[PDB]
Every structure is written in C-alpha cells, then in structure tokens.
Design a binder for this molecule. Sequence first.
Ligand code: 5B8
Length: 128
Amino acid sequence: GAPATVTEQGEDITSKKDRGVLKIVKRVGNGEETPMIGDKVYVHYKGKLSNGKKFDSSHDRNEPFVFSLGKGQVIKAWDIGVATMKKGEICHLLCKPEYAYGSAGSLPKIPSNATLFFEIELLDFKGE
Ligand SMILES: COc1ccc(CC[C@@H](OC(=O)[C@@H]2CCCCN2C(=O)[C@@H](C2CCCCC2)[C@@H](C)O)c2cccc(OCCN3CCOCC3)c2)cc1OC
C-alpha cells in the first residue's frame, strides 16, 4: 500500500524525530529552492485516512489548493512537509494524529487519533 511504503521507506522530517511526519519523494522537483514561511503556496493533493476512508482531492474541484506556509493555516504535517518540497516535486506524507487532528479528531469526518496519508504536488510558491 501507498501508506505502508511511507512507513517503511519514508524519512522522518519532524524536529522531535518521533516519526510523526514521514516523507517519500515520488517525483523530484526543479532546482534547489524550497518555500519560506509566509510564502503563498499552490498545490494539488490527494489525501485520505490511512485505512483508505474519507478520500479528498483538489483535482476533482479543478483548482489548486492555496495557503500561506508556516502560519498554522493547515495541519502541522503540511507546514512541516511542504516547507521541504521543491517546485514541481511530488511527495507522499504519512501524518500521525499528533501532527493532524489529534485525539479530538474533527467529527463527523475525522475520527479520534486518525493517521492521514497525502500525496502532494508543489506547483508554485511566491513571497509574502
Ligand atoms: C493545526 O491547524 C489547523 C488548521 C486548519 C485546519 C483545517 C483543515 C485544513 O485542511 C488541512 O489541514 C488538511 C491539509 C490541506 C488539505 C485539506 N486538509 C484536510 O485535512 C482535509 C482532508 C481530511 C481527510 C483526509 C484528506 C484531507 C479536510 C479539510 O477535509 C483546511 C481545510 C480547508 C481550507 C484550509 O485553509 C485554506 C487556506 N487559507 C485559510 C485562510 O483563508 C485563506 C485560505 C485549511 C486544521 C488544523 O489542525 C487541526
């Protein structure tokens, strides 16, 4: 499975090194630069619970998902994960609940202590 591969081959990109955000590069991006805090980032993504449930994709609404990086506009995994990406990169992220919705979850969609899996493509990033 796409999740287990991240469990097995993924790099722990967390600061505390608690394996709470694991990353695999599936497609290498351009050049060397990676986004700054406050950069307006554009992505397409596909995501779901680790168990395959609650699938969501930006593609099926024909629009890039946009947010400001490192400002807490998204789950912690996304701020940590997207900051490591190069433009045009595609990566897979496995995100423990501590770096997503925690014990509370977000009902009715996200249950308590859900692990989330994402495929993220970094389309672009520009300055604050
Ligand atoms: C830690 O801080 C948090 C900050 C925000 C949220 C709200 C959810 C946030 O979405 C997410 O963080 C992730 C990553 C981005 C894609 C959507 N996300 C999801 O979990 C979605 C799915 C959950 C099921 C698995 C597949 C993804 C959820 C919204 O249905 C989300 C959803 C929709 C929009 C959004 O922000 C748009 C960016 N800006 C926000 C201010 O207005 C300008 C746009 C952000 C939760 C947080 O933690 C519990």
